[PDB]
Amino acid sequence: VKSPPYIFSPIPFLGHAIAFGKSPIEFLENAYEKYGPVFSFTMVGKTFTYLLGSDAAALLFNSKNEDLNAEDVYSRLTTPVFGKGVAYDVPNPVFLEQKKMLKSGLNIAHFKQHVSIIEKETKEYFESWGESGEKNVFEALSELIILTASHCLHGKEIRSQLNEKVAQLYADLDGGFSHAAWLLPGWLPLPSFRRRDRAHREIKDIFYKAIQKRRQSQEKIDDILQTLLDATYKDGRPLTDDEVAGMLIGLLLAGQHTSSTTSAWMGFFLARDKTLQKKCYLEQKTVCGENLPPLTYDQLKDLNLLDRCIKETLRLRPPIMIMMRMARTPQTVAGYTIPPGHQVCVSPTVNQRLKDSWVERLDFNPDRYLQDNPASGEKFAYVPFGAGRHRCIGENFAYVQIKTIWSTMLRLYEFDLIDGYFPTVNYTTMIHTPENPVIRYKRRS
Template structure:
């Protein structure tokens, strides 16, 4: 009798599951894509190392011109590569954050990256003033100081042949972030700074693993997995360090008030601005809110900035004619001076900015973002069903020949004003687009230009590996598996720089 009831109950559950999914399955079957198998879908395609998975993804995507349906177990993912389709989706009021972002929540909490609805709108309104350009100018001294330390540390590699510059760039980036976001430096943290960077990288990889290894998606399975135990270990360390810094900074904030003569709040790092932020009712951010936003800034800024710098230097090392144009522009702005870089200098370095933009086009640090339709979205070729995950394939969109002639060619002229105007604005979105656009994009751009300008005022960069030899992997952040291999030569016989 019990067995019979269990069979009946199982049948009812399966029927209910099928009945509620029939619309999604019907519309999903009308979207082109590789053959999916029962229960596992296309899941076996994504079995392997990150670089192998990324290669398989790119192979699938090249087979379809606008969109493709991929099933990870029972979960439907629709990948979009066309700027016009992306515009329809991102402008729709029927989309919200994809469910996959919840995998980051134990680590990043309800930060701007994760939150939705009224909390997202309120907190974004409180945080956005921190990223106003007038506030970012305060950090130029920090940017210059750490970029100069980087330049000096690279002297040991001059004339030594090719090496992976990633660790040098990563050290510079994490030190800048620690100082500008949390107000601490490597001397304060010691080897914890390196560990913090390492744990952020590890957590990013674990989140990526849970997305593509569909059997780890259900909480009931993930809870007892080795991946969960590893994740908890890293989160405990990062949360503990961040909470300690918040406590100390908060104490300092309330003791000194950090106010200038006019009584206005004066802050020196992002955490200060978060501590002082108040909404129209005089209510500020909670300690949990501040912790979430600080960790998100560290996560979003560290690997993305490092990889953009690495790809840019690799490409300049390959394309010497483009590097010549950058060096000419630097000479016009700075001459033979080794003075610090000012904000006015940043504005004058237009060709360098085009080079960075073109690097971000070909190698966006975040190669995709995800959305969840809460209602069907009609495109001109098909309908995207509610309940699926829509992958906005930034890397594919930015290599679309309809938007970028000869899209695989590294060509900074793609970002001349007249060429920008001729394109769909959604054809270039390395920092996302719309209300979810990265609030730190201006911060990242200024920092990247300062570091590149500092390096290229002192060194000439060379690289022997062509772009076709790049081995790419996308563990949340796009990277070169073999590292960013370059060689350096002094532009002059001596470096007239002294580290701070």
């Protein structure tokens, strides 16, 4: 019995909070060099054990939630935002159920409907960018995705009510996943704490009556909202209007931030690699034809390069940069015993660019998958949607949304860096944001 290498720190309480805050990826890779796949360090009077590489990460992915707990760590931030009796508020077994329900709502039939829906929103949104210029993609994209994710995941009724004042109510809920909300106790009245709660009431308010306007009209609609309203536990019990509104919040935020960032990033990887951009456009005409008809689900599958570009964006810029659990009981990896109390973490970012396995690691090269790579050679080197019990459910949908949008976009414009500036990464927010994401765009010929 031996516990992980511990990284001592001179600072009394902060610990590594400043160095890790600067560049977490730099911090963690160096730590990998000095100490290996398994190490501990303290930050803000908290101890963290990291697991790097596929083998060590296996601990986290394979374990049972009674052993590595996700509520113990996520709940602080989630419950105030999403709502009571949903996500990390309920026992895991109850949550597995809520997932199985949502998952059902993400099936080919619904995606088929989504493609055109998304393609419309994209075309219409960009009517105000005209023929050329230099604008903020990340800003645009997150505005559009809030629109597309809404139409798809919240149905027509709710989407038609998305104005500026609702956009703000969501933006107030973004300010819940913060530095301060994780450490400080929920009785210190920071401005954000207050707004996060205000918007939660105001938005559940909107969902409350929008639910029932569908709970009534006999107009048979087959969408995500419908699925939820019709679904049922092993109990037989249906979801209360509270539960339903709850998981509507989860759906919008999860499905909105993770796609915007990714989409936004791919824009720059594509504008930087101009030939790779043109082969993406060429692939569009090959798979869809010169006339370029509207898009259908069936065409997406044959957009292989585009798929590998998305797979490559997610490799280098995974929206979920870290994943965490509380050790409720002692766990063993690489001969080390992690003591109950440590917060265990894995970083897809580190794993997916690790030197031992990713050849030309910092290169944006979608052709890497047409070779030998750890994404197939190994179980947990490529993990942008996680693995095991806490596995993502949105991957199908996320690919649908990003695929359609970028297809449509490559059809509308050609994109270039401004003076050859490729955005750097900001860590001020959990949200993996690109520095100064303004892009040059001219009409496609």
